[PDB]
Amino acid sequence: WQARGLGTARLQLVEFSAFVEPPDAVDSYQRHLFVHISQHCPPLESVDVRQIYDKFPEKKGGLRELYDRGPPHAFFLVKFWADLNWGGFYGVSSQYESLEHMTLTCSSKVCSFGKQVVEKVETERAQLEDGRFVYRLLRSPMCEYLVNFLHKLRQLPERYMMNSVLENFTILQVVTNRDTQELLLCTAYVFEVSTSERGAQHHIYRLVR
């Protein structure tokens, strides 16, 4: 009964993206994806969660405890290769599906050297479409820390230097049923930089113990 993409029978990720629209987008629209998961559309490889304890805040909110809460089958790792060739709008959009009408709490902890730099928490509430309930956290604004991190990171003269910094930069993302405090989806993000010719790309793992 193992996961075949990023979700559970109780909450699935439809689509995630982090993006910038340039100011000339009003003239003709364009967006650049830094990172992108689409599951609008085989079992998933696994990673032992102890291997990535150290990259994360290791106290309340942290990947150790949340796994100990369970359920373990809600836990994933996403390796992102971010695409970094591009006063615009810097945005994040998430979209989730469920069969339950729920109210989600959506936390994103940014940890830099495994250490919580910013936490953003939004709650979102269901809408009913084709039987499934749909949760849209669309066009949430990027944390200013990431926007300025991105501008610094892109100017590094060597891609191995970006991957050296990004080896210390992680994001933990926890989706909770607000009414029952009850964990649906935990996603740990680690990052490299992709190349010029390749765009954004990702690989999803199960997290196990």
Ligand SMILES: *CCC(=O)N1Cc2cccc(Nc3ccc(C(F)(F)F)cc3)c2C1
């Ligand atoms: C604080 C901003 C926020 O809520 N985000 C949550 C989140 C989760 C995953 C990815 C991103 N965006 C992102 C990730 C990595 C890069 C970089 F290029 F540096 F690798 C840029 C953007 C967010 C933003």
